[PDB]
Amino acid sequence: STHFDVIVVGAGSMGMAAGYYLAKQGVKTLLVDSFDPPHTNGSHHGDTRIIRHAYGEGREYVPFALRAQELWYELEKETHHKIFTQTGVLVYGPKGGSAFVSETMEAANIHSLEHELFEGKQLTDRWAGVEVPDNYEAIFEPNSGVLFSENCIQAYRELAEAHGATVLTYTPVEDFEVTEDLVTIKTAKGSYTANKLVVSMGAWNSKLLSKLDVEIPLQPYRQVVGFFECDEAKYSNNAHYPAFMVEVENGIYYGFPSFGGSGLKIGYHSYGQQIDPDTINREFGAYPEDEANLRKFLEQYMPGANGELKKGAVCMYTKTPDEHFVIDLHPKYSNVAIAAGFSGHGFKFSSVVGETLAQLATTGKTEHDISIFSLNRDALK
Ligand SMILES: *Cc1cc2c(cc1C)nc1c(=O)[nH]c(=O)nc-1n2C[C@H](O)[C@H](O)[C@H](O)COP(=O)(O)OP(=O)(O)OC[C@H]1O[C@@H](n2cnc3c(N)ncnc32)[C@H](O)[C@@H]1O
Ligand SMILES: [Cl-]
């Protein structure tokens, strides 16, 4: 049979999670992907992702993150793959000059999250490998940390398939035909139907959501990360060097302690190239900005980590104008759920988004507050 209860189109961060939460409750599921997840053509590779809880971008993100973390700890117990390590997350920036730092500190206070404050040289006294100007301030969230993103997806896939999920790889969906009774997807090697549809195509949502007659502002961006050889005594996870997300003079950078000699991983969040996901150049170094922007940060703030570029990765964000997610039912078809526009900060929530999508596909509603992620909101018109 080519009929399923639910088809998930795009089996990456959000879709593979949805497939797991569906399949584990006995929902007959088909997961369809253009590639073989986890892979290096979407938004989930580069090994590691930050999860943090002191989310200043809006109050609704906080219970979403707290649920996500509960779900990650549950996944850790079910698989042999490593899911999460509690590095803590350091946020810093200029005193009275970083909306991001201020909003984080306020969030940590409002929601009563465990944290510690540092000013200036106090940062370096805690972690030798970081140096900031005297007028910088910082907040450290010790309970947050790092997800091994490719492991997360692989674990969800293995568990979903063992529960009965069917996974179709190297099979791009070319079109959708939907009614309220029947969902049909068209591919090169044939068609499949279901009762319900979950659409979670990452950067390709920006090209293919038009096939469901949904028109929203989504812009893919090419975002690189580099791994640098570094003094392990200062920058290893074994030395308790934290993951970080910081605001400096030219914007926001994020990074990770070295794990097993991977080197320190760093990305520049505040710039990337506007791209089409079918023609993006996935070679690190293809643009001179790739390495240059990373070294400018390291030589100033983490000078002992400004070593050999061991490797690089090219990844994509998909941004909405307000940088809030889109998680909703299709306005015409109550049997179609859409997850899009994660704006470079969606991985940490992929567990709870998966759970939400499974609830939406299965019941038409969710217990979680997704009010700020709606399709009908003014920023998307
Ligand atoms: C790239 C980036 C993102 C990022 C990050 C650093 C970089 C360099 N750092 C993060 C961080 O530390 N903390 C965090 O919470 N998120 C961070 N991110 C953002 C995050 O990775 C993304 O928001 C998230 O991965 C997006 O998930 P999504 O599920 O939306 O995207 P995907 O994993 O790429 O999955 C999409 C899948 O769909 C398949 N596809 C595409 N088109 C089709 C068609 N036509 N048919 C079938 N399948 C399709 C893709 O192949 C992919 O598997
Ligand atoms: Cl994204």
Swiss-Prot record:
Name the record gives this protein: Monomeric sarcosine oxidase
Cofactor comment text: Binds 1 FAD per subunit.
Catalytic reactions on record: sarcosine + O2 + H2O = formaldehyde + glycine + H2O2
Presence of keyword Glycoprotein: no
GO cellular component, as recorded: cytoplasm
Family, as annotated: Belongs to the MSOX/MTOX family. MSOX subfamily.
Keywords on record: Cytoplasm, FAD, Flavoprotein, Oxidoreductase
Principal EC category: oxidoreductase
Organism this protein belongs to: Bacillus sp. (strain NS-129)
PTM sites of type S-8alpha-FAD cysteine: 315
Cellular compartments annotated: Cytoplasm
InterPro entries: FAD-dep_OxRdtase, FAD/NAD-bd_sf, MTOX, SoxA_mon
Single GO MF annotation: flavin adenine dinucleotide binding
Subunit and interaction comment: Monomer.
EC number: 1.5.3.1
Main location as per UniProt: cytoplasm
List of residues binding FAD: 5-35
Conditions for induction: By sarcosine.
Organism taxonomic ancestry: Bacteria, Bacillati, Bacillota, Bacilli, Bacillales
Main function: Catalyzes the oxidative demethylation of sarcosine.
Encoding gene, per UniProt annotation: soxA
Cofactor: FAD
